Structures are given as structure tokens and as C-alpha cells.
């Protein structure tokens, strides 16, 4: 997250870190057994780390649970990032308390202008690299589809939306992928991609989770 | 408007430009009928200002525009200049606008009308396109 | 950049609750927010229309009023809420 703020320990209790010996993506806890992340974060042997604040320090509220299943959307297109969603089943149920909690899925698509919370442990710099220890947060609006398409002509599918700041300076960035865009208490987005981070006219692009609620239900129900 | 787009000329016929006596645009307005424009109270419209209807291109001197004198400004008395609440003023025109393809009225809602959150609406104007 | 040519933007109405996420207590009942969507009303737009369709007809829902000091397209523009003011409009027209 560029241009964000330190969330505060466990204030984003659905945020998880996907770890394969290092933090490589985020994700969002959607119930005790399941995490939503981005399909481009798919890899074997994911360990989901819940209740993290400082991802480089054992602080005592962590739950590390291995992925038992990492189910990429079956129409995921790694070239355009269309359907960039994945569900990760935890090998064991996470212990849900104040510091580890699921986030609700949308019951409807959020409208543009709605303010969201995007969080993660990604790069905090728009040029160069600085990875935070603690979870960073950014309030960002959903941008209208027309703004999003204007920013990224030919690249914005119906399964994507932009959120952030056309003026630049605030965005999600590498290491945030897979993580949450939460708007009025619903997971509307998954950190997906962008042209750089926090660049003028290049807002982050997010997987439109509201399009996937049935698929998520179905995948959960089927696994 | 930042990150808007140029309107089809004449396609927002109620949009007026509030100009000073020199033609300097300082606020917009909307015609709600031939004789009245509704604008923001904070714009500080006075009867020295003029309502220009029918403009598309303020850089053009060749549009059929109407420069309409303001007979009377009715600032909403509830307007709070510090909080900008109740930010409306009516301008009664000295002479009726002549409605035409490019000049006509916007509809006024009823007080009970629900324009739901999420509704895509449109704003128009000659404000800055880039801050 | 000021434009010679009339501009327009489509933008979503925000709930006063959503708008308050940005503007907090500044948002009054006679205000309605729109935008925070990649467009913004900006200086010189004030007083102009925020219009929505009501049964095919464009209806003045807002009057450009105020918002981001930098016209940030990620902050809602705040518009005078015409439904809250239209009674006054009608009464002024009636009396005049």
C-alpha cells in the first residue's frame, strides 16, 4: 500500500498474508475455513497467516494454517487477469476471535464513489521498494467503470474495477495482491493489478468480488 | 469538471454561465423556466452579473447565446456561508429567456423525490478541467 | 485548465452516510454528494446542475456547491440537495 497508514494491530482481522517462505500476496478470510485471494497468487504450498500485524515479527496473535486447496477461478485468464480470484481452503479451521474474523461478501455490487479499505503488506513506495512490517491501510473510493476504462483502455473487464486516486500517490502495490478491498463491511474487491502503483491516471484495479459470490458459495459448498 | 468530457453542444440547454459584466464566467446556473435560474448561493450573484444561456463554447463569439440581465437575486435566507448549507439562490431574469433547441429548462424534483444513492447522474459546467 | 467548451461528467450519487465517510459532519441534510468516482466538479462549476433522470427527464437533483480544495476526483463533490430546497424554490417563484 502506497500512501496509506498503519492500520493498527488486528484492526483488519480478515486480512491474511499468503506466505511461501515470504509474504507474497494477501487474502481475505471469508469464513473459518476459507480465504479469498487473487488467482495470480496461486501457488502450491501456500501457508495462510492470520491475525498478523507485523508480518516479520511473531507477536502472539498469529495463526499459520497451510492451504489445503487453492482453487483458482476456472475462467481465470493470467494474461488479462480477468476472473482474478481464488479460494483457499485452510487445512484446519482458523480460530475466529476479535483479531481473526471473516469479512462478509457483497450482497450487491458497490457503487462507484463508495469508500473502501484496501490493506496489505505490499510495497509502500510508488517508485522503488519498501515493504512494511505492519499492515498498511488505505481508504480509497471505487472509481466509476468509465474512469477505470479510460485509465486502462481495453483492459478492464466486467470483473474488474478501479479504486484509488487518479491524482496518484495512494494505491495498492506489489505484495498487496489478493488482499481486501472492503467497502461498507463487504469484501468488494481483491487487489489485482495496475500500471505501477500510485501513478497518476493509473488507479489499482481490483477483482469485482460481487460478481463471484455464487462461484464462491459454490466452491465453498463443493470443497 | 475534472475528468469529464466535452458535452454535445446545446445538449444541456438549461446550463447557464453566470458572468460578470465583462463576460467572465464565475459560476454556472440552471434555467428552471424562462424567467428563473437556480444557482448556488455562495456564487455571490448580483444584479450586475449576467446569465448567459445557450453557450457551448465560451471562446466562441459566434453562438446564438442569450445574455440575460438579472432583475433580482433571491438568496435562500437559510444559506449558511460558513457551512455552505442551503446553498441555493434564485435569479429572476429582467427579461425571459427565449427557449429554443439550446436553451430550455431543467426539471425540478418534488421535495419527496428519492434519488437513490448509487444513481448515476450528470453534472455539467465550465469549471476547471484540471486543478 | 479551464474549458471554453461546456463539460459534463457522469457520477454517482452517494448516500449521505457514504459521503460522510469523506466529509464527516460537513455534510448537511440540504447537501447531496456525488462523485469520488474519478471525476469532480471544480472551480467555476458551482451553481451549475447535478441532474438525474426522473422518468426520461433530467431533473435538478443537485447544485454544484463545494468539495475538495483540489477537486480531487476521489473525494465526493457536494451539491446543494435540491429536494431539500425545492419547496423554497417553489415558494419564491410563487411569491415573485
Amino acid at each position: 500500500i502506497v500512501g496509506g497508514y498503519t492500520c493498527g494491530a488486528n484492526t483488519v482481522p480478515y486480512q491474511v498474508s499468503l506466505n511461501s517462505g515470504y509474504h507474497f500476496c494477501g487474502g481475505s478470510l471469508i469464513n473459518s475455513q476459507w480465504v479469498v485471494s487473487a488467482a495470480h497468487c496461486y501457488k502450491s504450498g501456500i501457508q495462510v497467516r492470520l491475525g498478523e500485524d507485523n508480518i516479520n515479527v511473531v507477536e502472539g496473535n498469529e495463526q499459520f494454517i497451510s492451504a489445503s486447496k487453492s482453487i483458482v477461478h476456472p475462467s481465470y485468464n493470467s494474461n488479462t487477469l480477468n476472473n482474478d480470484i481464488m479460494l483457499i481452503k485452510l487445512k484446519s479451521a482458523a480460530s475466529l476471535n476479535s483479531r481473526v474474523a471473516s469479512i462478509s461478501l457483497p450482497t450487491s455490487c458497490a457503487s462507484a464513489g463508495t469508500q473502501c479499505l484496501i490493506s496489505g503488506w505490499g510495497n509502500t513506495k510508488s517508485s522503488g521498494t519498501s515493504y512494511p512490517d505492519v499492515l498498511k491501510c488505505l481508504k480509497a473510493p471505487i472509481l466509476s467503470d468509465s474512469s477505470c476504462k479510460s485509465a486502462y483502455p481495453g483492459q478492464i473487464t466486467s470483473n474488474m474495477f478501479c479504486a484509488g486516486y487518479l491524482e496518484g500517490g495512494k494505491d495498492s502495490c506489489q505484495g498487496d495482491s489478493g488482499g481486501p478491498v472492503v467497502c461498507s463491511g463487504k469484501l468488494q474487491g481483491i487487489v489485482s493489478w495496475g500500471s505501477g502503483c500510485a501513478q497518476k491516471n493509473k488507479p489499482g484495479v481490483y477483482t469485482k468480488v460481487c460478481n463471484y459470490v455464487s462461484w464462491i458459495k459454490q466452491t465453498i459448498a463443493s470443497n | 469538471i475534472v475528468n469529464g468530457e466535452e458535452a454535445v453542444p446545446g445538449s444541456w440547454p438549461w446550463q447557464v454561465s453566470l458572468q460578470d459584466k465583462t463576460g467572465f464566467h464565475f459560476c454556472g446556473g440552471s434555467l428552471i423556466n424562462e424567467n428563473w435560474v437556480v444557482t448556488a448561493a455562495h456564487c455571490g450573484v448580483t444584479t450586475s452579473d449576467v446569465v448567459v444561456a445557450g453557450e457551448f463554447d465560451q471562446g466562441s463569439s459566434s453562438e446564438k447565446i442569450q445574455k440575460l440581465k438579472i432583475a433580482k437575486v433571491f438568496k435562500n435566507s437559510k444559506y449558511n456561508s460558513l457551512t455552505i448549507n442551503n446553498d441555493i439562490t434564485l435569479l429572476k431574469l429582467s427579461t425571459a429567456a427565449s427557449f429554443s433547441q439550446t436553451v430550455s429548462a431543467v426539471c425540478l424534483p418534488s421535495a419527496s423525490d428519492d434519488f437513490a444513492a448509487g444513481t448515476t447522474c450528470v453534472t455539467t459546467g465550465w469549471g476547471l478541467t484540471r486543478y | 485548465n479551464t474549458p471554453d467548451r461546456l463539460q459534463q461528467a457522469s457520477l454517482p450519487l452517494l448516500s449521505n452516510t457514504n459521503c460522510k465517510k469523506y466529509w464527516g459532519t460537513k455534510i448537511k441534510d440540504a447537501m447531496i454528494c456525488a462523485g469520488a468516482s474519478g471525476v469532480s466538479s471544480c472551480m467555476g462549476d458551482s451553481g451549475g446542475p447535478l441532474v438525474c433522470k426522473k422518468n426520461g427527464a433530467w431533473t435538478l437533483v443537485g447544485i454544484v456547491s463545494w468539495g475538495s480544495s483540489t477537486c480531487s476526483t476521489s473525494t465526493p463533490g457536494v451539491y446543494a440537495r435540491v429536494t431539500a430546497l425545492v419547496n423554497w424554490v417553489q415558494q419564491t417563484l410563487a411569491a415573485n
Partner: peptide, 11 residues
């Protein structure tokens, strides 16, 4: 009212 003679075209 509210129905422009010249229809707005919005992107």
C-alpha cells in the same frame, strides 16, 4: 423541461 432538444451523449 428536462428533455434536451439536442440529446446529451455521455461516455
Amino acid at each position: 423541461c428536462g428533455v434536451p432538444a439536442i440529446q446529451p451523449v455521455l461516455s
